[PDB]
């Protein structure tokens, strides 16, 4: 469980290369390639959860995220082994098509994660969100599989998507991510972040009670934002967009 | 209504230790031991047995409020002798006495049944 303090933004791919150089001028570090695959699961509507205390609202149903890393050998087509595995490959990832299709992901079926809507009030300068996390290491039995496990808990699959981007590690534990997101269905693959990169700068705090640390984290994030003034505008997203409860449906992408 | 549940008299809550031992800061070789979910039945027996050890100086117990099931015991023994060891000896002696008592009662009851 962490308090994640975050700021968001977006950029057009035209400046992409330039942006990268500037980051290396500041951090002093080179970018590192990465990828991931997230699957979202929701409580089964076939089961009537009368246990939701309607007269008191002790709790509301929520959605579970399962993440995993996928090797690049599934994301590189027959035209791309010649180039080395570095960040420049992202320049060729502008098409809505991608080597990883629905059948391979179905064949695949980790990190389990749950979150809450950010803290209310208009006196917050950065998006503060609470995250509860655990890890699944292995399994066994006659039906050892992620799908069977989540159906045993009482959850069913809803959708999935694939993230590819680069990471920058700066001082004080600040992490800056440049991402491209591909939604995947049997109908096909569609790039929601079409013609651009999604930028997200964030820090993690282990204990929410410590307030000196939280103040330091906010100071670092606002200093970073004030450093990038004039190039990219980093902003607090909409509090109602980062809500992932089942009752109301929307997805920040 | 504010009447507490009765089962709190014999079921320990989670995170509760049946014994708690604390050194006493006033007299050397003295310990205060808190027992939980217990009443005079055990404290009187243990104190009466601890009064038979020639190396035991002080042994006293109390139940501060008759609402809560718990009591305190206080032990002080001679130098070179541990109060926990005294408690262990007392419990062993009590157990042996109760076993002998049970055997005697069973023998007498069977003899009466033969004479019944």
């Amino acid at each position: 469980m962490v308090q994640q303090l975050s700021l968001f933004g977006s950029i057009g791919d035209d400046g992409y290369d330039l942006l990268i150089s500037t980051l290396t001028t500041i951090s002093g570090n080179p970018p590192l390639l990465y990828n991931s695959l997230c699957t979202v699961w929701k409580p089964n509507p076939s089961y009537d959860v009368e246990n939701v205390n309607s007269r008191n609202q002790l709790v509301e149903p929520n959605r579970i995220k399962l993440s995993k890393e996928v090797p690049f050998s599934y994301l590189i087509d027959e035209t791309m082994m010649d180039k080395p595995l570095n960040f420049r490959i992202l320049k060729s990832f502008t098409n809505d098509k991608i080597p990883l299709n629905y059948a391979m992901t179905r064949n695949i079926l980790w990190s389990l994660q749950i979150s809450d809507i950010p803290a209310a009030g208009n006196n917050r300068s950065v998006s503060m969100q609470t995250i509860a996390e655990t890890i699944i290491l292995s399994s066994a039995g006659k039906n050892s599989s992620v799908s069977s496990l989540m159906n045993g808990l009482g959850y069913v699959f809803e959708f999935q998507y694939l993230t590819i981007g680069v990471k920058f590690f700066m001082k004080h534990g600040l992490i800056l991510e440049l991402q491209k997101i591909w939604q995947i269905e049997e109908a096909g693959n569609s790039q929601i972040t079409s013609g651009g990169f999604l930028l997200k700068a964030y820090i993690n705090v282990s204990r929410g009670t410590d307030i000196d640390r939280i103040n330091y984290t906010e100071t670092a994030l606002m200093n970073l934002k004030k450093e990038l003034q004039g190039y990219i505008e980093l902003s607090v997203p909409d509090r109602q967009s980062m809500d992932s409860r089942v009752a109301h449906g929307n997805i920040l992408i | 209504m504010n009447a507490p549940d009765r089962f709190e008299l014999f079921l320990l809550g989670e995170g509760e230790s049946k014994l708690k031992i604390d050194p006493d800061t006033k007299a050397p070789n003295a310990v205060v031991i808190t027992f939980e979910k217990e009443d005079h039945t055990l404290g009187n027996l243990i104190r009466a047995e601890l009064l038979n050890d020639r190396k035991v100086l002080f042994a006293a117990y109390k139940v501060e409020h008759p609402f809560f099931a718990r009591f305190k015991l206080r032990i002080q023994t001679t130098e070179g002798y541990d109060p926990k060891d005294a408690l262990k000896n007392a419990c062993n002696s009590i157990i042996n006495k109760l076993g002998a008592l049970k055997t005697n009662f069973e023998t007498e009851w069977n003899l009466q049944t033969l004479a019944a």
Binding site: P30, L32, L33, Y34, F72, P84, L85, N86 | -
Partner: protein
């Protein structure tokens, strides 16, 4: 994955033969008759880069896996004493 991490891993691993702990092994085979050939394997290591540890494995000529003795030593004096004892035991075995 990324080029930089693999490059650094390669460059660092290139120095293993220098940075790694030195080791040595000496196998001594004694010529004995009656198809009973004991083996004496002594491996010398420096786990903390300064101290000498001598592991001795003496297998008498009874079985391929029945290790007669397997000991460790940190004092060379005890090493010499046990070597003398083993030599005396072998001489007695040859005399019986």
């Amino acid at each position: 994955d990324d080029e930089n991490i693999t490059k650094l891993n390669k460059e660092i691993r290139a120095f293993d033969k220098l940075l790694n702990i030195p080791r040595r092994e000496l196998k001594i085979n004694l010529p004995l008759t009656e198809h009973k050939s004991p083996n004496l394997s002594l491996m010398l290591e420096s786990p903390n880069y300064c101290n000498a540890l001598i592991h001795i494995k003496f297998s008498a000529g009874t079985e391929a896996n029945a290790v007669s003795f397997d000991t460790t030593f940190s004092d060379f004096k005890e090493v010499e004493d046990f070597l003398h004892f083993i030599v005396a035991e072998y001489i007695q075995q040859k005399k019986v």
